[PDB]
Amino acid sequence: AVIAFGKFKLNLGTREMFREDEPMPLTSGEFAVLKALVSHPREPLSRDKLMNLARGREYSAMERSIDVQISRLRRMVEEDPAHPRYIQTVWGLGYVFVPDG
Amino acid sequence: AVIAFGKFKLNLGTREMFREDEPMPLTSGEFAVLKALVSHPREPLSRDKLMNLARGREYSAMERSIDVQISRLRRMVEEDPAHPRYIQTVWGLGYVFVPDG
Protein backbone atom coordinates (compact mmCIF):
# COMPACT_ATOMS: atom_id res chain seq x y z
CA ALA A 1 0.00 0.00 0.00
CA VAL A 2 1.00 3.66 -0.47
CA ILE A 3 0.48 6.35 2.18
CA ALA A 4 0.64 10.02 1.24
CA PHE A 5 1.01 12.98 3.59
CA GLY A 6 2.25 16.48 2.82
CA LYS A 7 4.75 16.24 -0.02
CA PHE A 8 5.64 12.63 0.86
CA LYS A 9 4.64 9.22 -0.47
CA LEU A 10 5.51 6.03 1.40
CA ASN A 11 5.22 2.58 -0.19
CA LEU A 12 4.86 0.08 2.66
CA GLY A 13 5.71 -2.83 0.36
CA THR A 14 8.92 -1.73 -1.35
CA ARG A 15 10.08 0.76 1.35
CA GLU A 16 10.46 3.66 -1.11
CA MET A 17 9.83 7.18 0.16
CA PHE A 18 9.47 10.28 -2.01
CA ARG A 19 9.59 14.00 -1.25
CA GLU A 20 7.46 15.36 -4.11
CA ASP A 21 8.42 12.27 -6.15
CA GLU A 22 12.18 12.56 -5.59
CA PRO A 23 13.47 9.57 -3.54
CA MET A 24 14.59 9.95 0.05
CA PRO A 25 17.25 7.57 1.44
CA LEU A 26 15.57 5.83 4.36
CA THR A 27 17.40 3.86 6.99
CA SER A 28 15.78 0.56 7.93
CA GLY A 29 15.24 1.70 11.52
CA GLU A 30 13.63 4.86 10.18
CA PHE A 31 11.40 2.88 7.82
CA ALA A 32 10.22 0.35 10.41
CA VAL A 33 9.19 3.03 12.93
CA LEU A 34 7.54 5.21 10.27
CA LYS A 35 5.67 2.14 8.97
CA ALA A 36 4.41 1.32 12.47
CA LEU A 37 3.19 4.88 12.98
CA VAL A 38 1.39 5.29 9.65
CA SER A 39 -0.09 1.76 9.86
CA HIS A 40 -1.76 2.97 13.08
CA PRO A 41 -3.04 6.40 12.04
CA ARG A 42 -4.10 8.75 14.85
CA GLU A 43 -3.32 5.94 17.31
CA PRO A 44 -0.54 6.84 19.77
CA LEU A 45 2.10 4.13 20.09
CA SER A 46 4.38 3.96 23.12
CA ARG A 47 8.08 3.15 22.80
CA ASP A 48 7.47 -0.37 24.06
CA LYS A 49 4.82 -0.81 21.35
CA LEU A 50 7.13 0.61 18.69
CA MET A 51 9.84 -1.80 19.87
CA ASN A 52 7.42 -4.73 19.47
CA LEU A 53 6.33 -3.56 16.04
CA ALA A 54 9.59 -2.26 14.58
CA ARG A 55 12.29 -4.33 16.31
CA GLY A 56 10.22 -7.49 16.45
CA ARG A 57 13.22 -9.78 15.97
CA GLU A 58 15.20 -8.57 19.00
CA TYR A 59 12.01 -7.98 20.98
CA SER A 60 10.73 -11.56 20.57
CA ALA A 61 14.16 -13.01 21.34
CA MET A 62 14.10 -11.07 24.62
CA GLU A 63 10.61 -12.48 25.24
CA ARG A 64 11.71 -16.10 24.64
CA SER A 65 14.75 -15.63 26.86
CA ILE A 66 12.47 -14.72 29.77
CA ASP A 67 10.66 -18.05 29.28
CA VAL A 68 13.97 -19.98 29.33
CA GLN A 69 14.94 -18.37 32.64
CA ILE A 70 11.52 -19.22 34.09
CA SER A 71 11.82 -22.80 32.87
CA ARG A 72 15.34 -23.08 34.30
CA LEU A 73 14.34 -21.61 37.66
CA ARG A 74 11.46 -24.09 37.95
CA ARG A 75 13.81 -26.96 37.16
CA MET A 76 16.15 -25.82 39.95
CA VAL A 77 13.62 -24.78 42.58
CA GLU A 78 10.36 -26.74 42.29
CA GLU A 79 9.60 -30.24 43.50
CA ASP A 80 7.32 -30.64 40.45
CA PRO A 81 8.22 -28.08 37.75
CA ALA A 82 5.06 -28.97 35.85
CA HIS A 83 3.07 -27.87 38.97
CA PRO A 84 5.32 -25.17 40.46
CA ARG A 85 4.54 -23.83 43.93
CA TYR A 86 6.72 -20.69 44.02
CA ILE A 87 7.24 -19.58 40.41
CA GLN A 88 3.71 -19.69 39.03
CA THR A 89 1.80 -18.46 35.97
CA VAL A 90 -1.38 -16.48 35.78
CA TRP A 91 -2.45 -16.69 32.16
CA GLY A 92 -2.94 -13.35 30.53
CA LEU A 93 -1.10 -11.40 33.24
CA GLY A 94 2.41 -12.84 33.74
CA TYR A 95 4.64 -14.91 35.98
CA VAL A 96 4.39 -14.57 39.75
CA PHE A 97 6.32 -15.46 42.89
CA VAL A 98 3.99 -17.02 45.51
CA PRO A 99 5.54 -16.88 49.01
CA ASP A 100 5.12 -19.40 51.78
CA GLY A 101 2.82 -16.86 53.43
CA ALA B 1 17.89 -8.36 51.81
CA VAL B 2 17.35 -12.13 52.11
CA ILE B 3 14.22 -13.92 50.86
CA ALA B 4 13.42 -17.43 52.05
CA PHE B 5 10.95 -19.87 50.51
CA GLY B 6 10.82 -23.64 50.85
CA LYS B 7 14.36 -24.90 51.37
CA PHE B 8 15.86 -21.88 49.56
CA LYS B 9 17.45 -18.62 50.67
CA LEU B 10 18.13 -15.82 48.20
CA ASN B 11 20.37 -12.85 49.04
CA LEU B 12 19.34 -10.00 46.72
CA GLY B 13 22.55 -8.10 47.46
CA THR B 14 25.29 -10.67 46.87
CA ARG B 15 23.31 -12.97 44.49
CA GLU B 16 23.93 -16.10 46.56
CA MET B 17 21.27 -18.81 46.56
CA PHE B 18 21.14 -21.80 48.92
CA ARG B 19 19.22 -25.06 48.85
CA GLU B 20 19.09 -25.86 52.59
CA ASP B 21 22.29 -23.81 53.02
CA GLU B 22 24.27 -25.51 50.25
CA PRO B 23 25.03 -23.03 47.42
CA MET B 24 23.32 -23.27 44.05
CA PRO B 25 25.15 -22.00 40.94
CA LEU B 26 22.89 -19.29 39.53
CA THR B 27 23.23 -17.85 36.06
CA SER B 28 22.92 -14.07 35.86
CA GLY B 29 19.81 -14.31 33.68
CA GLU B 30 18.32 -16.70 36.22
CA PHE B 31 19.18 -14.38 39.11
CA ALA B 32 17.79 -11.22 37.51
CA VAL B 33 14.42 -12.80 36.68
CA LEU B 34 14.14 -14.51 40.08
CA LYS B 35 15.00 -11.19 41.77
CA ALA B 36 12.29 -9.39 39.81
CA LEU B 37 9.71 -12.01 40.75
CA VAL B 38 10.49 -12.16 44.48
CA SER B 39 10.83 -8.35 44.71
CA HIS B 40 7.20 -8.25 43.53
CA PRO B 41 5.62 -10.97 45.67
CA ARG B 42 2.18 -12.21 44.60
CA GLU B 43 2.26 -9.61 41.80
CA PRO B 44 2.15 -11.16 38.32
CA LEU B 45 4.78 -9.76 35.97
CA SER B 46 4.41 -10.06 32.20
CA ARG B 47 7.35 -10.90 29.96
CA ASP B 48 7.60 -7.29 28.84
CA LYS B 49 7.77 -6.24 32.50
CA LEU B 50 10.39 -8.88 33.27
CA MET B 51 12.40 -7.64 30.27
CA ASN B 52 12.27 -4.08 31.65
CA LEU B 53 13.27 -5.23 35.12
CA ALA B 54 15.80 -7.96 34.35
CA ARG B 55 17.30 -6.93 31.00
CA GLY B 56 17.15 -3.22 31.71
CA ARG B 57 20.36 -2.47 29.80
CA GLU B 58 19.23 -3.88 26.44
CA TYR B 59 15.64 -2.80 27.07
CA SER B 60 16.53 0.87 27.63
CA ALA B 61 18.87 0.89 24.64
CA MET B 62 15.95 -0.31 22.51
CA GLU B 63 13.86 2.49 24.04
CA ARG B 64 16.44 5.19 23.22
CA SER B 65 16.82 3.88 19.68
CA ILE B 66 13.10 4.46 19.08
CA ASP B 67 13.60 8.11 20.08
CA VAL B 68 16.51 8.50 17.63
CA GLN B 69 14.38 7.18 14.77
CA ILE B 70 11.57 9.57 15.72
CA SER B 71 14.01 12.47 15.88
CA ARG B 72 15.52 11.51 12.52
CA LEU B 73 12.12 11.13 10.85
CA ARG B 74 11.07 14.58 12.08
CA ARG B 75 14.29 16.07 10.72
CA MET B 76 13.57 14.53 7.30
CA VAL B 77 9.82 15.05 7.10
CA GLU B 78 8.67 18.09 9.09
CA GLU B 79 8.84 21.75 8.10
CA ASP B 80 9.45 22.55 11.80
CA PRO B 81 10.71 19.46 13.66
CA ALA B 82 10.23 21.26 16.96
CA HIS B 83 6.49 21.57 16.05
CA PRO B 84 5.90 18.46 13.93
CA ARG B 85 2.64 18.12 12.01
CA TYR B 86 2.71 14.42 11.05
CA ILE B 87 4.89 12.64 13.62
CA GLN B 88 3.52 13.97 16.89
CA THR B 89 3.72 13.16 20.61
CA VAL B 90 0.96 12.66 23.09
CA TRP B 91 2.65 12.71 26.47
CA GLY B 92 1.99 9.65 28.54
CA LEU B 93 0.67 7.58 25.63
CA GLY B 94 3.23 7.51 22.79
CA TYR B 95 4.11 8.81 19.35
CA VAL B 96 1.41 9.20 16.72
CA PHE B 97 1.03 9.72 12.98
CA VAL B 98 -1.52 12.48 12.24
CA PRO B 99 -2.79 12.27 8.64
CA ASP B 100 -3.80 15.14 6.42
CA GLY B 101 -7.39 14.06 7.04
Oligomer: homodimer
Number of strands of chain A: 6
Rg calc of chain A: 21 Å
Most extensive interface, chain pair and sizes = A-B, 53 and 53 residues
* CATH arch. level architecture of chain A: Orthogonal Bundle
CATH fold title of chain A = Arc Repressor Mutant, subunit A
Instruction: Give the H and E element order of chain A.
Output: EEEEHHHEE
End-to-end gap of chain A? 56 Å
Query: Which strand order spans the largest sheet of chain A, edge to edge or round the barrel?
Result: 1-2-3-4
Structural class of chain A: alpha+beta
Subcellular location (chains A, B): Cytoplasm
Protein name (chains A, B): DNA-binding dual transcriptional regulator OmpR
Organism (chains A, B): Escherichia coli
PDB class: dna binding protein
Give keywords.
22% strand, homodimer, 3 helices, two-stranded antiparallel sheet, 6 strands, alpha+beta, Arc Repressor Mutant, subunit A, dimeric, dna binding protein, 101 residues, transcription, DNA binding protein Transcription factor, four-stranded antiparallel sheet
Task: Describe the protein's topology.
The structure is a homodimer of 101-residue chains.
Chain A: E1 2-5, E2 8-11, E3 17-19, E4 22-24, H1 28-39, H2 47-54, H3 56-77, E5 87-90, E6 94-97
Antiparallel strand pairs in A: 1-2, 2-3, 3-4, 5-6
Domain OmpR/PhoB-type (chains A, B): 1-99
Protein name (chains A, B): DNA-binding dual transcriptional regulator OmpR
DNA-binding region (chains A, B): 1-99
